[model samples]
Target: EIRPTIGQQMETGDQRFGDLVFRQLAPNVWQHTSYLDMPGFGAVASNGLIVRDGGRVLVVDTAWTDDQTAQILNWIKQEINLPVALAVVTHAHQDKMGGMDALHAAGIATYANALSNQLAPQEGMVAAQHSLTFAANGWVEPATAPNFGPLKVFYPGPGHTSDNITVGIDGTDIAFGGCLIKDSKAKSLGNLGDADTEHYAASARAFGAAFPKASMIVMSHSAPDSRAAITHTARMADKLR
Candidate 1:
């Protein structure tokens, strides 16, 4: 079952922004926070985003459960005609790739480091189906995605995670930056138990230099549309030096 909006559970003392960040980024991109009251850790309201280009859709990161993936799919069908042609897993985290089976069953191709094929199914993709915990749905094995068009994917180095790969869509000059960026004022990235701080910082700088023509930037977890939100990723990289 999908988790209810956390806004109702906000404590009397808790600060509430209430819809401050529900804004679109590009012609077909939106940033959603499934959990309004909870910021991180098992909230399942992760950095989920979708982009439509050339009659195809690209989904970055998946939320917690199959019900959540259904919500994203519903939003896509309502707003655009493009079927999910590709679902890119930016890393190996469950919140990032757990729903690949759901998207694949619906005819979407999946792309990620080859390692994902080994990591995801072992996590919850199979259990989610068996438990009947998420709408009694079954999952299909996703086919390996072939490189196509002008899109350039660069694995500069491991940043937030070792499998993280920043995908740069070549023609439109748009990029889906994963968790390499945190908040706007962040001078350093958080320690995610296994992250290499020095490597993460270096990777950010390299990504910024490589995507210089990027007219638009999409962070997997930030409030886009604001000038601050768009440039914050690059600005923080500048502070690295």
Candidate 2:
């Protein structure tokens, strides 16, 4: 299930923030545009990517609302003329999965790790509240969750959250690793709240040993083009351990 921002709680009148933030990044990859609203920490959504190959487009993570999804779809319609083939979620976060319902309703196949369907909703709610309260002085957004679609799901181990999993684009040699892992830089890894630090590192290592075959790595938060970035991320887990 995806979490909503304080600005997206479906109040009387509002424009979906996620929809307005879309931009293309590569030949087959596009990202939703976002503006950082929170200060100091510089919180920005940098919504995920979309991949178009042949005629089908695979949206990595959904935006924050029905309107946002529509905006993304509109852009795609103008560019490709085909509906999203699948909406692939990187994890159980609300920003990543919130638009699943809208995408699926529009005929997109939706899939994520089974654990996300169960744990993401609960965690997303708590996370939404924490974020809203901190940023807006006491406003928690309502959750408009997404249903989990039938897909091959497995635990890559445990990173970001125990339910976190990597979605491999079969035959394409590319994978989306949500927040479970991020590009190596000053960003490092997020604080492992409610996680098995040991297992998180183990899961990342497990993926590292196999992900090099893919031509690219897609992250929910950053631009992906290098294989070493994932390997560096997995190696960070050991450093964390």
Candidate 3:
């Protein structure tokens, strides 16, 4: 029942651009992964999503640098039929929006939660061009996403970051858990440098509760998992509270 659209599935080459790689994760949904070399963590990988929006697309997060983000745009332009007309950066973390300058230069019209933009420069991350005006600590509707197609983005309290957001694509029933929710195989919350641990339980619980129909949970740093991964994260975070 599972089929890979591009990249490693191909008999030959994989879709790679520097430290970034792109591959299909679901019908009309593509996932991209890139790395940021950290001191002790070594080459840590982070992922972003690209979902079909009408005839265009809405990409989530950048590729950690302008060069890789440009590779992302180039891949979309050359491979996916849809053009990247709209985008979102889940939080103010460098792994999420580090490649923002490339998006800004491409005139891609990026949007995000206001706190993400406000916390951008303070955290030394790039700011998004537009915003949803307010932070949604709970689930919101598609209208909150505008031209973002079937995606409904929400701020699920403060866990990974104060303004971390997740998205549930209405048509696909696939949730992009961002960095707030953990992959099924993850053992612990990776980083708390900018996290609110006391509220982490609330964040994971609400995110899990909000998207019951999401049969698949797509994470920012690991392979996609079953919908139950939401609860996995909820329970994991709950123990920390």
Candidate 4:
């Protein structure tokens, strides 16, 4: 029942590109990682999701740049061979949405948090075409294709950025915490320029509570991880306050 309607069921290993990597996480879900070279940070990696339902796919987040996002789109066309029906960006950062133009050019419908789109220009990132307005602590289930599981987007009182958001599938154990949740290699809070230090710890806890069943978190900067990443992020946020 959880399988993709039209795809084969085999766990895929890493498929590496020049600066991007792709892998299947579930029958309907695939993950992609793209790297951006930061002068001081060397190569910085960010992650995203690809979800298929029937013949079309839904992507979450873009690669770190327009070119990188185009690479993902091309790969999907050549390999996955499904039209990208939708894409939802998690936040406004370059790591979250540095490739909106590429998606638009390919004729993909896209969305993002209302706040994220509002902040996109300041970050030098393009905003998605549609805006998903959410409340302070609740979640929003976007409109989806018939019988397709909708991605539940949550804004947990702000963590990485005032506009940062997280999303998860309704029936899957996987969730994307974006840059708000760190991987095992993360040291500090990464970039605190737009962070909400006081409410960050609470936001992290809110994320865990929202997805009690999510064990495999598709984080932004590093590999997917267990629920411990949520706990770890909460702990790190606590120290900032």
Q: TM-scores for all candidates? A: 0.67, 0.68, 0.88, 0.89
Ranking by TM-score: 4, 3, 2, 1
Q: Let me know the TM-score candidate 3 reaches against the reference structure.
A: 0.88
Q: Each prediction's Cα lDDT score?
A: 0.53, 0.56, 0.77, 0.79
User: Which segments of model 4 are wrong by more than 4 Å?
Assistant: 1-12, 141-148
Question: What lDDT, from 0 to 1, does candidate 1 have?
Answer: 0.53
lDDT of 3 by residue, 101-168 (tens): 99989889988788889999998987898876443447554455666667787778889898898888
Best by TM-score: 4
Q: Write the per-residue lDDT of candidate 4 for residues 1-241, one digit (tens) a residue.
A: 1122211122358777656778888888888877766565456667799888778888899998899999999888887798888888988888778899999999988888887888888888887898887654557644522233557788777888888888887668998888888864456777888899999999888988989899898887666888888888899889998
RMSD of 3: 4.7
Runs with alpha carbons beyond 4 Å of true place in candidate 1: 1-22, 36-44, 121-150, 225-241
Model 2 — TM-score against the truth?
0.68
Whole-model lDDT, model 3: 0.77
Which residue segments of model 2 deviate by more than 4 Å?
1-26, 33-36, 39-43, 104-107, 124-154, 170-173
Error of 1 at 24 (Å): 3.0
RMSD in angstroms, candidate 1?
9.5
Per lDDT, what order, best first?
4, 3, 2, 1
Badly placed stretches (over 4 Å) of model 3 are: 1-14, 39-41, 134-137, 140-144
